[model samples]
Target: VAKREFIRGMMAHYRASLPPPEHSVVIHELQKRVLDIGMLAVNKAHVELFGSHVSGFCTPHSDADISLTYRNFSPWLQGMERVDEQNNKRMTRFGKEASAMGMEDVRYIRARIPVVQFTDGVTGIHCDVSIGNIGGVENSKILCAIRQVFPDFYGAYIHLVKAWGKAREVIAPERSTFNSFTVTTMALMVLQELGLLPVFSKPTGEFGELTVADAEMLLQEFKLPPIYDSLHDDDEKLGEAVFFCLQRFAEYYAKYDFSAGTVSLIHPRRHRTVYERVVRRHLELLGSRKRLEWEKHIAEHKEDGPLDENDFSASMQNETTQRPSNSPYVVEDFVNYVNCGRRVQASRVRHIQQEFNRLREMLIDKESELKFDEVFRESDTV
Candidate 1:
C-alpha cells in the first residue's frame, strides 16, 4: 500500500504538469494561422493532429504534430518515385511561406518523412508539419486506443515515464535516442510482460471508425487478474498493481538485451526466432555496401509490391524484417512495421541501458527512502 501511494504521489506530481486548457486553444489558432496562409497545397490538404496531443498524453512540453495529407498521396510508405524529393519540395515551400507569415525558426527537416518545423509567433508553441504521413495518423489512433483501453492511471504512468526519459536526457531522436513513440511502446510492452495487459488490440478502419466508445469496449470484456486480492480496498489494490508493474518495468528493462532481444506490441512474449534470422541476415549485408545499395538489392529480390494505406496486414510479419536493421535498439511499430528506434546510435543504446539500470537501482535501494521528487525530476527544457 505504501509503495502504491509512493508511485501515485509521483503520478499526481506529473499530472499537475500536463498542458493547460490554453495549450489547445493556442494550437487551434496556430493551425488556423497555417491554413490562413492560402497556399494552394495547404488549401487542398487536410490537416491532421497526431502524436501526444491526439494520444491524450500531451505534457506541457509536447509539440503539436500536424500532417497535411492528401487523397491517395502516401509517399512515405513506398511506390511514388522521388517521393522524398517531392515531400521536401512541398515542405520547403511551406517553411518559406510560414516564415513569410511571421512564424519564427521556420526550418525544413529532410528525414525519411520530410517535415516543416516552426514556432507559432503568437503562441510561441513549436509545431512539426509533415506531408502525407498517414502512418503517423494511424499510429496516433493506436496510441489513443491504448489510452482508452487503459485508464487515467496508465496515462499518468506514461507522463511519468516520458518525463523520466526527458530528465535523463534519453529522449532525443536526432541523436538516435528514445522518442515518445518508442517510450510509450516500451511502457506498453512492460505492462504486457508484467501481465497487467493481456494483449494489444490493433484498430482497423478510418479515424472516426475507431471511436472512443469502440476503444473503451476493448477493456470491457477483460479484467486484470486478482494479483492484489489481499489488498484492503480499491485504492490500495490499484496502487499496488500500478507500482508493482512499474518496479517490474525498471527491473525487466535493466536486464533486457537489446542486441538480441526485441520490443514489440504485436507479440505477447519475447521469442527471437524470426528476429534472430532477420538480424543475422541484416548484419551480413550491412557491411557489404551502402544502405541504399542493400535496400535496392532487397527491393529487387522481394516478390510483393509496396503496401497501400488500408493494408494493416503486412505489419512486422512481412515488411520490416526485409530491411537492413543494424541498430542496437529494435522496436517495430504495430501500425507501420517501421523500426521506431532505428536512429538510436550504438553508444546511445548503451546509455539508455545504463539509465534503466540506474533507475532500477534507485527503486530497489534499501538505504534511502525513495523520494518521488528525485525519481520524477524535471528537465530544464522538457
Candidate 2:
C-alpha cells in the first residue's frame, strides 16, 4: 500500500481534468445537431447530452454520450429479434441512418446494447447516441450528482479509479472486460458498502414511464442539485481510501456470491420480500439455488407481479423457462458485463473475481500504495 500522499496526488491528476476545449465545443455542437435530427425522427424525440461530459467527471479525451428521449416509442423493441419485421424501419427511425441528419459514419452498433454511433466531421466529435433513453440520462446524473454530493469521497475516488482504468486501457466497453459505466457502478457500490453514501430501498410504488416532455422537464429540474448526506470522513490519506475501497470491492466480488447474477448495489430494493423469503428458508438449504426455486419464490408473490420494472426481472423469466436448473442470477448492465446468455460470460466473471482477490491480496501485503497500473487488467476468458 502506498502512502496517502501518493494516493492524493494521483487523484489530483484526475480531478484536474475535464474534456478539453476542443471536445466541449464539438460535443455541444453535436448535441444541437442531434436535436435537429431527433425532431424529425421519432415521436416527441428530444435530444440531450448526458454522461461524464455533462456530469463534470470527464477526462481530457472522453467522448460525449447523448440520449434521444421518445415517448411514442413502443416497448415492443424489448422483445425484438434480428429477423423481426419492421426492424429496418426501426433502424432508420431510431438506429442506423437515424434521420441521417447527414452525419458522418453514423450506424447502429448491434453489440449487446442498442446503441448509435456517429462522428461529426465538422466538429471532429465522436458521439454514442441512444434512443428513448430517459433512464440512462437520469441514472448518469444521479451517480454524477453523488460525486458532487460528497466530492472528497465519491468524487476523488471515482476520479482516481477512472484515471487508473484509463491509464491501464481497461476502461472501454470494447475491451470485453469492463466499461467506464461499470467502473462507476463499482465505485458506487463500494462506497455504498463503506456507508460513505446513503444505501437503502425506497419503497417501490411505480415504475412510471416517462414522456418526452415530462422527461425534458425532469432533466431541466435535475440540473438543480438534489440533497445528499453531508458527512464525509474521507480525509484519511489517499492510501487508506484506495486500500479500503478496493478491499471492500474485492471482498464483495470474492465472497459475496455475485454468481446470483445480481449486482445488489443498484437495485437494492427490488423484490424485497422474495429475497427475504429465499434467505429465510430454502436458499441456504440448497447450497446452490436453482432458477425453479427463484420462480417458485417469486410465484408466491405473483399477486404483486413479482416482475420488476427493469429488464433484470424480465431476463429472469426467460431464464426460468429456458436455462438449466443450475443457472445463476444475472444483471445485464449493472452486474454481468458481457452478454448474460453466453457461457463465456461466466468465465469472464470468474476471472474478474480472481482478479479482485489478487489485487486485494496485493494491497494487504504492500507497504507502498503503488499506481493502479501495477495491479490492473482482469482477463477476458471465461
Candidate 3:
C-alpha cells in the first residue's frame, strides 16, 4: 500500500534526522554546571531529568528539561508549595550563576511553573531548569515505559509525529498549539483504543524520599507489567504498524467531538461537560481553602464524579489548573490527572483537526501519492 511504503521511507528519514549522539555529552556537561551552582547556592542540591531527552523522542533542536530539588525540601513527591517568590528567587539565583559561568541568554520564565531557561555557551544546546517538578519526572517515566514496551513501532511513529508537528508548526504551545507532551499523549490514546498498549500503573518508588542518584536509577529501571514482554511479536511489521496507528489516529481525531468528550487514555473517551462542572466546583472550594466544603461537595456529587480525594489533593498541590471551561481541547493528563492540553485553544483545535483530516484523506485517496517530504516539508523555501 502507498501508506505503508511512504511510512517506511519516512522512518528511514526520521532515524537519520534524530538529535546527534554528541548532544548527550553536552546535556551531561550542562547538568553538571547546574549541580555545581546549586551546591554553592543551596547545599545538597540535586537534579533529575525529564522531557524529550529521557523519553527518547528528541528532535535535533529539543531543549533538555531538568528538575532541581534539594534535601529536606517540602515533600518532594507532591507539587511545590505555592511560594512563588521562593521559586522565583531560586530560579534567579540559577540564572545569575549560569550567566557567570558563561551560559548565554540566561532568563527566568515566570510561568505557572517557574523555570530558568538558557542556551549552553559551550555546546549551544538549549536547557530549561525547573525546581522540584516531580510530576514531569513521573510523566517522563510513563513515556519511557511506553517506549520500552513498543520501541520499534510506537517510538518511530512518535518521532515522525513530533518532527511533523515541529515542521508543520502545529505543536507550538506559546501559540496555544499542541506541545510535544500533548501530541505524544494523543498518539498513546490512539494506541490504547486499538488495544495495543498495556494498562499503566502509577510510577514506583518514593521519588521525594529518594536521593537524586537513587531517583535517576529508578527512572532508568522503571518497568511495565510482565505481560508486556509477551507482546513483542510484531517486530517485523514496522511500516504496516506505523501506518495503521497513524491512519487510525488521523481518522479518529478528524471527526472527534471536542465539545462533548475528551481524548482519554484510561478510557476510550470521557464526557467533557461532566469534567468541566466537577473541576469548577473543585477549584471554587480549593480557592476558598475550604477542605470540609470540598469533601461535602465530593460526597454530594459522587454520582457524576470523575475525580476523588487524591485528584482533589493533587489539583490543590499542582498549580496548573484544568483547561478553561471554554477551551476547546481537553486532553486528560493520563499521568497526573491534570489537563495536559490546558494551554491549547479553539483555533489550535481547529488546526489540529484540519491537519488530521488532510492526512487521512491523503492516505485514503487512490489517485494521491503520499510523499514523506511533502507531508513533513516544514517549508518549501527551507
Candidate 4:
C-alpha cells in the first residue's frame, strides 16, 4: 500500500508541475499566427499542428510545431533536379513572407523537408512550420491513438519528462543532443521495456494509414485494455500509468553507465551497449554546455542573485504548516540540505543531479515513495 501510495504521490507532484491552463490559450493564438502565414502559401496549403500541442506533451514555455502542407509541393520536392536549391528558394521565400506577416526571428532551414521557424510576440511562444510534412501529421495520428488508448498515463508522463528534459538542458535538437521527439521516443521504448504497454512492439500503428480517423479505426482494434495491469492476470496495479512509468523509467536509467549502457528502440529482448568512453566524452561535452547555459540563465535572471541563508529562510517563510510528529524520513538534516539546495537555486540544472541522487537512494530505501512526513519535497519548498 505504501509503495502504491508512493507512486501516486510522485505522479501527482510531476503532474502538478504541468503548464497552467492559460498556456494553452497562448499556444492557440500562436497557432493562429502560423495559420495566417500558411494562408499566403501561393498554393493549396493545409495546416495541421504536430508537436507538443498535438502530442499532449507540451509545456508552458515550449514551442508548438505546426506543419503547413501543400498537396503538390511533395511532388515538386521529389521532381526537382536541384532539390536542395529549390527547397532553399521556396522555404527562404516563405520565411520572408512570414517576416512580412509580422512574425519575429524568422528562419527558413532547407532540408530533405524544408522548415520555417519563428516566434510570435503576442503569445510569447516559439513555433516551427514545415512544407509538405504529411509524415509528421501521420505521426500525430499515432500519438492521438496512443492517447485514446491510455490517455492519462502517456499524456502526463510525456509532459513531465519533456519538462524535466527542458530543465536538464539536454533536449534541444538544435543543440544536437536529445530533442523532444527523442525524449518521447525514449519514454515509449521505456514503457515497452517495462512491459507496461505490452502491445506496442513497434513505435507506430497502421503502417499504411495517412489520416487520423482511418488510423484510429485500425489501432483501436488491437490495443488491449488496462495496459499495465495485465502483466500478471491476477495482480492489480494501483496509481496511474504515468506514476509507474516514471518509477520504471527512473529505476532503469538510474544505474546507467554511459560506457556500459545500451538504449534499445526496436528490439524486444536485446539491447546493444553503447561505447562508454565515446558516450562519456560526449556527455562530458554536454555537461560543459549545460554549465554554460546555466551560467547564462543566472546572468539573465540577475534580479535575485543566488540566495544565501537569510534569503533562503525568507523564501521559506510561507511554509506555515508544522512537520508532523511521526514522519517517515530518516535523515532530516540531509533532506533539508537537499531542500535548501533546491530552494536557493531552484531553477538551476544542478537539482537534476540532486533528483538523481535522491532517486538513486530510493532504489534501496523502499520507503522513498516520493514522500516524507516532513514535507521537504520540492513542492513544499521554494
Maximum-TM-score candidate? 3
TM-score per candidate, in order?
0.75, 0.64, 0.76, 0.58
Between candidates 3 and 4, which one is better according to TM-score? 3
Per-residue C-alpha lDDT of model 3 across residues 109-137, encoded as one tens digit per residue? 88767788888787777888888877688
Over 221-247, each residue of candidate 1 has an lDDT whose tens digit, in order, gives 655565544442454455555666667
- The total number of steric clashes, by the backbone 3 Å criterion, in model 4 comes to 1
In candidate 3, how many Å is residue 10 off?
0.4
* Residue-level error in angstroms, candidate 2, position 296: 32
lDDT of 2 by residue, 1-382 (tens): 2546555555556545745567666677777778777667666667878878765667666777887666544332332332122333444665434435567788776533467777765665677886645555655655555656545556566766676555544354554456666666666666665665544223121222222333233333332122232224444444355556766765665565543434434343224334334223322222123334434434764653343334434433443332222333332232111222223244455555565566566556563655544654443343
Instruction: Write model 4 residue lDDT over 1-382, tens digit each, in one string.
Output: 6655655554565556567878767666777777677767536656778876776666566677777765445422232234335556666766877899888888887653568888875666787888665556655655666666555567666766665555544354443334566456556657766654433333322221124554455456644455454532321242444555665766655544322223333332222222223223333443344345434434665643342334323322322111111211111111011111111222433333345455445533554544422222222111
Model 1: residues >4 Å from true position, as ranges? Answer: 1-9, 38-43, 76-84, 201-220, 225-240, 270-273, 276-326, 378-382
Steric overlap count per candidate: 1, 9, 0, 1
Q: Please state every model's RMSD to the true fold in angstroms.
A: 7.8, 9.9, 8.6, 17.5
Candidate 1's displacement at residue 32, Å, is: 2.8
Kindly indicate the candidate among 1 and 2 with the higher TM-score: 1
Best-fitting candidate, scored by lDDT? 3
5 in model 1: Cα distance from truth in Å?
7.9
